[PDB]
Write a protein that binds this DNA or RNA. Sequence first.
RNA 1: UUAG
Lengths: 205, 52, 51, 51
Amino acid sequence: PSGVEGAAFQSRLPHDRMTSQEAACFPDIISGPQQTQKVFLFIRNRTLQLWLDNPKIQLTFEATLQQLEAPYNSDTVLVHRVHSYLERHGLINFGIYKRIKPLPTKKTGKVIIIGSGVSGLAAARQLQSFGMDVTLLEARDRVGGRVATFRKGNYVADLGAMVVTGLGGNPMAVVSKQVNMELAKIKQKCPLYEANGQAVPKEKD
Amino acid sequence: PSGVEGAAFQSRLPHDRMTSQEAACFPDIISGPQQTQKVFLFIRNRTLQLWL
Amino acid sequence: IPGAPQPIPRLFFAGEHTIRNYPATVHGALLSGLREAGRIADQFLGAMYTL
Amino acid sequence: IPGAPQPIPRLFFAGEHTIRNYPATVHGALLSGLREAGRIADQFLGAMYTL
RNA sequence: UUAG
Ligand SMILES: Cc1cc2nc3c(=O)[nH]c(=O)nc-3n(C[C@H](O)[C@H](O)[C@H](O)COP(=O)(O)OP(=O)(O)OC[C@H]3O[C@@H](n4cnc5c(N)ncnc54)[C@H](O)[C@@H]3O)c2cc1C
Ligand SMILES: Cc1cc2nc3c(=O)[nH]c(=O)nc-3n(C[C@H](O)[C@H](O)[C@H](O)COP(=O)(O)OP(=O)(O)OC[C@H]3O[C@@H](n4cnc5c(N)ncnc54)[C@H](O)[C@@H]3O)c2cc1C
C-alpha cells in the first residue's frame, strides 16, 4: 500500500471498486460507464490521501480541489459530492483536528448520547462538527468507559483497553497522530513457567 | 423484444444492466459480483413479464 | 396520532457490540460512533450529496 | 421552531412538464404521476425494500 | 429545561 492505493487500504476501502455504501450515495455513477467510476475512485482515494497525510487539520472542499490536478479538478460538483460523503461518513475530518471553517453559532437538532466511552465520544465530535447540539450523559465520574487507565504518580496501568492491534487500516493510526500517544512495540518473546516454577524448555513450547 | 428481454423493453428498462434507480435501492447487489446482478435482472425482467 | 405517517427514527445504537467486522475493540467502538453520527446527520440534516 | 431539524419534504410536483424524457405527452403525465406516488410513499411510509 |  503506497500512494492513493494505500490511502484506500488505510481507510479499509478497495482502491479499484466502489462499495455498497458508495453505490447508495452515488447510484448515478456506479450504474453508468466504467470510465466515470475510475474518475470517482481516484478522487475518493486522492481525498483520503490528503487527509491521511495531514490529519492534524481540517481538509476543506476548497483545499481538496486546489490540491487536485486536471482533468479531475475540472468536475467540481463531483469533487464536492465526494468530499461531503467522506466528511459525513467519517473517513476524513474525524477525531481531533484544528478547525478551519469554524462551527456555526446556530445549531440544528438536539441529540442526547448515553455514555462517554469512545463510541459515544466519537459520535459527539462528529455531530458537533455537522452543526448539531450534542450532550453526553455519563454515569461514571470520568470519560473513556472501558478505556480505564490507573494512575499514581507517573506510574500508569491500563485496567481496560491496552493493545492497539495493528496500524494497517486502523483509524487509531490517525488518532495517534493527533494525540500525545506514545505507542510501543510488543516483543513477542514469551517464556512459560510450570506451576513448580521451572521454565518450559524451548522445544516443547 | 420477446420473452423477458421484451418485458424490460416494454418497461423502458435495459434487460442486461441495472439502472441508477435500481442501484439506489439495491446497492448491496450492484457493488458486488456480476453473477448476483444477473440473478437480480432475471427476477426483475421475469416479474415484469408476469404483470405485462 | 392515529393514521399519521412515521418516516423518521429516534433511537440509534452505537458501541463495540454494534459493529460486525470490528467487534470487541476500541477502533470498533470508534467506527460505530462515526457511523451513527453520519446516519443521524443524514436523517435530520438531510444528505445533500446524494442528489 | 428555531433550531429544529427538517428532514422531510411537503410539496411535490408531477405532470407533463415535470418529466424530462417524455414531456408534452399523456404517457409522460401518466409516468410523472407514478413517480411521485412512489416518492411520497417512500418518504412517508418508508421504503422497506432498501434495507 | 416550562427543551428549542
Ligand atoms: C479488561 C478489558 C480489556 C480490553 N483490552 C482491549 C485491547 O487490548 N485492544 C482493543 O482494541 N480493545 C480492548 N477492550 C475493548 C474496548 O475497551 C471497548 O470495546 C471499548 O472501549 C468500548 O467502547 P464503547 O463506547 O462501545 O463502550 P464503553 O466504553 O463501555 O462506553 C459506554 C459508557 O456508557 C456508561 N454507562 C453505562 N451505563 C450507563 C447508564 N445507565 N447511564 C449512563 N451511562 C452509562 C458507561 O459508564 C460508559 O462510560 C478491552 C475491554 C476490557 C473490558
Ligand atoms: C390540444 C392538445 C392536444 C394534445 N394531443 C396529444 C397527443 O396527440 N398525444 C399525447 O401523448 N399528448 C397530447 N397532449 C398532451 C396531453 O394532453 C397532456 O400532456 C396531458 O393530458 C397532461 O396531463 P397533466 O395531468 O400533466 O395536466 P392536466 O391534464 O392539465 O391536469 C391538470 C389539472 O389541474 C386542473 N387545474 C388547473 N388549475 C387548477 C386550480 N387552480 N385548482 C384546481 N385545479 C386546477 C386542471 O383543470 C386539470 O384538470 C395534447 C394537449 C393539448 C392541449
